[PDB]
Amino acid sequence: GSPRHTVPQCCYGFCIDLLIKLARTMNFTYEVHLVADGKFGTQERVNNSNKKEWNGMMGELLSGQADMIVAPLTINNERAQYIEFSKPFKYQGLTILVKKSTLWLLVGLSVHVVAVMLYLLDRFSPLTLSSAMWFSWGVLLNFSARILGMVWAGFAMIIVASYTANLAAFLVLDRPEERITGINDPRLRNPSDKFIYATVKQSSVDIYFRRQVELSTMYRHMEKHNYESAAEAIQAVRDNKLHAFIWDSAVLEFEASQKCDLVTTGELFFRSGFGIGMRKDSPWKQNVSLSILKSHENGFMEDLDKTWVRYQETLTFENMAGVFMLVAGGIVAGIFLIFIEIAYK
Amino acid sequence: NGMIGEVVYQRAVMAVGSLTINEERSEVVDFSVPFVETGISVMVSASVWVMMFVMLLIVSAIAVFVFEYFSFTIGKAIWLLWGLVFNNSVPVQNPKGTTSKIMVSVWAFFAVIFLASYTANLAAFMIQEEFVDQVTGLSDKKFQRPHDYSPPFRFGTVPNGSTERNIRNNYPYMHQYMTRFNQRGVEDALVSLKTGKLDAFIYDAAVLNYKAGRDEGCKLVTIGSGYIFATTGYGIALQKGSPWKRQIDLALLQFVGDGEM
Amino acid sequence: ASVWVMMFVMLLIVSAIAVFVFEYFSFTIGKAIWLLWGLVFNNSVPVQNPKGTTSKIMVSVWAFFAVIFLASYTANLAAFMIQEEFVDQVTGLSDKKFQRPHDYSPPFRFGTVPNGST
Amino acid sequence: GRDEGCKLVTIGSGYIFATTGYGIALQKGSPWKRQIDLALLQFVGDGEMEELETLWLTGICSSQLDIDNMAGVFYMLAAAMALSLITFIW
Numbered sequence: 001g002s003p004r005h006t007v008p009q010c011c012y013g014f015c016i017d018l019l020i021k022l023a024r025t026m027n028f029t030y031e032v033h034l035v036a037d038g039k040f041g042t043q044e045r046v047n048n049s050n051k052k053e054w055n056g057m058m059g060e061l062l063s064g065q066a067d068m069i070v071a072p073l074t075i076n077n078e079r080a081q082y083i084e085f086s087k088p089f090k091y092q093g094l095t096i097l098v099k100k101s102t103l104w105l106l107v108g109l110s111v112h113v114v115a116v117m118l119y120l121l122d123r124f125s126p127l128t129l130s131s132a133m134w135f136s137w138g139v140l141l142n143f144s145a146r147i148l149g150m151v152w153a154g155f156a157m158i159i160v161a162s163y164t165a166n167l168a169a170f171l172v173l174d175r176p177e178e179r180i181t182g183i184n185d186p187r188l189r190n191p192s193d194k195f196i197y198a199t200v201k202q203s204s205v206d207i208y209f210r211r212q213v214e215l216s217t218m219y220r221h222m223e224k225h226n227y228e229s230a231a232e233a234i235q236a237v238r239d240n241k242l243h244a245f246i247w248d249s250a251v252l253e254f255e256a257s258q259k260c261d262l263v264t265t266g267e268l269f270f271r272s273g274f275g276i277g278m279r280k281d282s283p284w285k286q287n288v289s290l291s292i293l294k295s296h297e298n299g300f301m302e303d304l305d306k307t308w309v310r311y312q313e314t315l316t317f318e319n320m321a322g323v324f325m326l327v328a329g330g331i332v333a334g335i336f337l338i339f340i341e342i343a344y345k
Numbered sequence: 346n347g348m349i350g351e352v353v354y355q356r357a358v359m360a361v362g363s364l365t366i367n368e369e370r371s372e373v374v375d376f377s378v379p380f381v382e383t384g385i386s387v388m389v390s391a392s393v394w395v396m397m398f399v400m401l402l403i404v405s406a407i408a409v410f411v412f413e414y415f416s417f418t419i420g421k422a423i424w425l426l427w428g429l430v431f432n433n434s435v436p437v438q439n440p441k442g443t444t445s446k447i448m449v450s451v452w453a454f455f456a457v458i459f460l461a462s463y464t465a466n467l468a469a470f471m472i473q474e475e476f477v478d479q480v481t482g483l484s485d486k487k488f489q490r491p492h493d494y495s496p497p498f499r500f501g502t503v504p505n506g507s508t509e510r511n512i513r514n515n516y517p518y519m520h521q522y523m524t525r526f527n528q529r530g531v532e533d534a535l536v537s538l539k540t541g542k543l544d545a546f547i548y549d550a551a552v553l554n555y556k557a558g559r560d561e562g563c564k565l566v567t568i569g570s571g572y573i574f575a576t577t578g579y580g581i582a583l584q585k586g587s588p589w590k591r592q593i594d595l596a597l598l599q600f601v602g603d604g605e606m
Numbered sequence: 607a608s609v610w611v612m613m614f615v616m617l618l619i620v621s622a623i624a625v626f627v628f629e630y631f632s633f634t635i636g637k638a639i640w641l642l643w644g645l646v647f648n649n650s651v652p653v654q655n656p657k658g659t660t661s662k663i664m665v666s667v668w669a670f671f672a673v674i675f676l677a678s679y680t681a682n683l684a685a686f687m688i689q690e691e692f693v694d695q696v697t698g699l700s701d702k703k704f705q706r707p708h709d710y711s712p713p714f715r716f717g718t719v720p721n722g723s724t
Numbered sequence: 725g726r727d728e729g730c731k732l733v734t735i736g737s738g739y740i741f742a743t744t745g746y747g748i749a750l751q752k753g754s755p756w757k758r759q760i761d762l763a764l765l766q767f768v769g770d771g772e773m774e775e776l777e778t779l780w781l782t783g784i785c786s787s788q789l790d791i792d793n794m795a796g797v798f799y800m801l802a803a804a805m806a807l808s809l810i811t812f813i814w
């Protein structure tokens with residue numbers, strides 16, 4: 001797009017005010033800036049001489065062009081193999097973002113045949129036709145021909161009882177599978193081209209799954225859909241191009257508070273901690289980690305919750321509305337049929 | 346004293362056992378990075394009828410038009426508009442109207458499907474299982490004064506524990522409240538909560554989750570997931586200057602990142 | 607298979623009372639079955655305005671049976687709705703289909719993998 | 725267990741079938757026949773075989789129909805037609 005010009009703009013938020021609290025604590029000045037790309041950092045073989053290199057924030061920190069990575073660093077083993085770390089502050093797991101008759105016509109065709117044949121057997125047994133029809137209208141819907149009509153009225157309750165039972169069954173038990181229920185979904189172990197699950201391109205979630213030696217299917221499946229930023233993923237799942245996304249819990253909870261259709265999943269896995277990316281043995285380790293634990297002990301964590309974390313932003317109208325629309329539309333035709341009797345009488 | 350002095354006076358090497366971590370413990374030794382999220386906690390025990398009512402006047406005007414077509418059904422028409430919703434079948438009036446016996450075959454079916462939808466509403470309410478909380482956390486108004494509310498309640502912590510020092514660094518007056526609210530035994534406090542000799546109790550949340558998963562009846566219920574609480578972790582304490590710390594931390598990061606944890 | 611028999615016997619026991627109740631105090635002597643089984647289902651049918659007080663007590667205790675009968679039948683429908691059957695036409699290797707596909711009307715087909723021990 | 729939709733349905737659990745097992749074929753006169761069979765029963769008698777079967781299996785897995793009820797209605801209305809014919813011939 002445009003990597004040409006680096007512009008000074010304004011930054012604020014969680015870690016900004018965290019570092020402001022650190023500057024209130026520790027005696028230092030700052031140099032706040034951003035990273036040139038959209039990657040956390042991955043160790044990959046470079047094109048020449050077959051040598052491993054880092055990228056993202058990690059390659060720029062190891063180049064000496066930076067001093068401190070104040071960021072939600074996914075702390076794992078391979079990052080710790082090279083540099084020293086602080087103790088984490090953001091403790092959270094992982095979640096998955098999702099987005100949230102004919103037989104009656106047969107009864108209606110049979111009931112008028114019954115209503116005709118009961119009167120046509122009444123004419124043999126010692127406005128009577130319309131009287132019989134208007135008596136039969138209240139049978140299905142609330143002397144031998146009376147013995148037949150009591151049997152038909154006995155069926156009239158059992159038909160609508162079965163209809164009530166299976167309409168309740170259509171909405172209570174068979175809930176549609178809008179959820180995934182986490183990693184143990186068999187439809188993601190051997191997926192298809194419909195369940196689009198993915199994550200951030202070249203992220204440490206992919207490295208954590210690369211350590212997982214039993215999920216080679218999902219590793220080579222997300223490569224068609226690894227995206228740069230999560231803001232890409234929000235619009236992609238908004239446009240129904242995605243179907244599942246792998247990210248932290250509280251960020252997606254805040255975005256569920258933003259957009260109501262953004263729905264997480266039930267399971268809570270990989271309960272990990274996030275800290276500040278640091279250099280090697282440095283004078284900004286002892287005092288700084290003591291300040292971290294001082295931030296843990298006081299109510300400044302609850303203040304940070306009050307900044308962004310704590311803040312947020314049957315009714316019977318589903319299937320009977322379409323029936324009531326036809327009911328309201330039939331009123332005009334029912335009134336118009338009275339004018340035929342006006343012209344008749 | 347305790348496990349601290351064995352490491353400070355170096356009679357021991359490291360504390361592999363579980364240990365809460367605060368500032369003054371980190372002053373004397375160097376803790377490892379934690380592996381489990383173990384916080385602290387407290388154990389305790391409109392327009393639907395309107396669209397019918399609008400069309401009710403329309404159907405009443407239709408009944409007036411039935412009276413204009415071809416002799417006192419006015420409030421009886423209100424009874425009929427009730428019965429086309431409820432079907433109570435009270436013997437009052439035999440409908441002799443030609444038009445009035447036509448729209449009843451739509452309205453009574455609407456009453457049938459409305460009754461079916463109300464049974465569906467009650468089944469959906471049966472699906473919904475509610476759980477309410479009187480106390481939300483440390484920001485409770487009950488934590489101002491137990492005399493401010495009508496029951497004077499009671500709650501304490503473990504004696505000679507780090508939670509005591511944490512609350513004394515949080516609220517020194519709450520130490521004065523707990524001074525008359527002390528206890529000795531953890532299972533003794535459990536029996537006091539079961540029988541009613543204790544109202545609330547502040548303790549580490551994961552041990553309370555382990556006891557609640559084996560709780561006989563699941564009567565005592567936790568509150569939340571550590572939202573208004575300390576929400577700390579459990580690491581391993583080592584001596585300052587021990588070369589094992591980096592290797593132990595790499596072993597921790599291997600033991601977490603494999604699912605064996 | 608024994609529910610309708612005792613319900614028939616109960617129907618006779620109920621219908622025998624309203625004969626003598628109306629006899630003590632003009633068309634529903636033997637016609638009480640047409641009212642009774644017609645108001646089992648509560649079909650909103652104009653049948654007869656009851657005048658016997660003991661007959662009204664009997665209708666009041668019979669309508670609670672009519673409520674609990676449809677309640678128990680909706681319960682039976684829900685219990686059958688829980689039962690999701692998994693039935694198979696072929697029982698095993700001794701199937702009648704495994705003699706000749708001309709015996710049944712659709713010509714079906716079944717085979718194995720080539721060069722198999724099966 | 726990995727079927728998309730679980731449309732194809734198995735028949736029983738091997739009751740009218742072969743119901744055999746899978747061994748390991750070795751040459752005649754091999755000394756490993758005792759030791760491999762000891763290792764098999766060690767791998768089964770600790771849940772480790774069950775752990776591998778838990779790893780490599782998945783024991784997972786809707787419409788209205790009342791054709792028996794409609795057939796009963798259609799038979800009882802024919803019986804009612806016969807009862808009406810009893811009154812018709814009288």
Ligand SMILES: *[C@@H]1O[C@H](CO)[C@@H](O[C@@H]2O[C@H](CO)[C@@H](O)[C@H](O)[C@H]2NC(C)=O)[C@H](O)[C@H]1NC(C)=O
Pocket residue numbers: 002003004005007
């Ligand atoms: C990022 O945004 C700023 C917005 O001011 C770009 O700076 C200039 O923006 C104006 C108005 O859109 C353009 O006409 C200029 O071409 C931009 N400057 C130049 C020389 O690029 C900024 O440059 C943008 N980043 C890039 C590299 O495109």
Ligand SMILES: *[C@@H]1O[C@H](CO)[C@@H](O[C@@H]2O[C@H](CO)[C@@H](O)[C@H](O)[C@H]2NC(C)=O)[C@H](O)[C@H]1NC(C)=O
Pocket residue numbers: 287
């Ligand atoms: C926090 O850092 C300061 C240094 O920045 C440490 O305090 C120093 O301690 C040494 C003796 O060990 C002496 O140079 C001075 O007494 C202190 N120097 C300054 C400039 O503060 C301190 O040890 C660190 N943390 C704490 C509070 O223990």
Ligand SMILES: *[C@@H]1O[C@H](CO)[C@@H](O[C@@H]2O[C@H](CO)[C@@H](O)[C@H](O)[C@H]2NC(C)=O)[C@H](O)[C@H]1NC(C)=O
Pocket residue numbers: 504505
């Ligand atoms: C909790 O701490 C107090 C500290 O006073 C213990 O009381 C005694 O204190 C004296 C003086 O410090 C010690 O010499 C004794 O060892 C303490 N009592 C004992 C164990 O004999 C108190 O006993 C401690 N125990 C609890 C859980 O109440």
Ligand SMILES: *[C@@H]1O[C@H](CO)[C@@H](O[C@@H]2O[C@H](CO)[C@@H](O)[C@H](O)[C@H]2NC(C)=O)[C@H](O)[C@H]1NC(C)=O
Pocket residue numbers: 719720721722
């Ligand atoms: C069983 O396997 C063999 C070998 O694949 C097949 O037999 C021959 O296969 C060659 C492969 O080039 C063909 O050219 C011959 O025509 C095959 N001869 C036979 C026996 O048909 C055989 O097709 C396989 N199928 C069976 C019998 O199950």
Ligand SMILES: *[C@@H]1O[C@H](CO)[C@@H](O)[C@H](O)[C@H]1NC(C)=O
Pocket residue numbers: 026027
């Ligand atoms: C920080 O250090 C500088 C060194 O000159 C000193 O002037 C300043 O007062 C210090 N600020 C504090 C009080 O932390």
Ligand SMILES: *[C@@H]1O[C@H](CO)[C@@H](O)[C@H](O)[C@H]1NC(C)=O
Pocket residue numbers: 044045046047
């Ligand atoms: C080759 O160089 C480009 C630019 O640094 C880099 O993005 C790419 O990953 C390299 N190729 C490989 C496969 O290492």
